[PDB]
């Protein structure tokens, strides 16, 4: 805020406060990776370890 | 004339089914042996000639 000068017989006037408040909304995101069984099976007895 | 058992309607009963009939199943696996392998295309080696 901004003071003034003021003599003793003006008048001593007032300022405004500045507020500015902020939201925001959650999201949710979300990945999906289609994998077949024959693969799911050639990484377990293959012994590739691909999906860990 | 008399007191019979349509008048009584009885359910009934169940003898649903057998537990061992013979089924034509699978003649081959008689034949020859399994011969169980990992999951992925078998590759073997064939001995043709005398």
């Not at chain 1, 408040?21 to 999201?27: G, K, L, N, S, V």
């Not at chain 2, 019979?4 to 034509?24: F, Q, Y």
Request: charged share 25%; hydrophobic share 45%.
């Amino acid at each position: 805020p901004r003071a003034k000068i003021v003599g003793e017989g003006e008048v001593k006037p007032s300022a405004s406060v500045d507020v500015s408040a902020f939201t925001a909304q959650p999201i949710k995101v979300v990945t999906q990776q289609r994998v077949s069984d024959e693969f799911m099976w050639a990484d377990a007895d293959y012994r590739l370890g691909v999906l860990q | 004339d008399f007191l019979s058992v349509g008048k009584l309607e009885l359910p009934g009963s169940m003898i649903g089914a057998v537990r061992d009939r013979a089924i034509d199943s699978g003649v081959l696996a008689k034949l020859s042996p399994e011969q169980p392998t990992i999951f992925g295309p078998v590759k073997g080696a064939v001995f043709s000639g005398v």
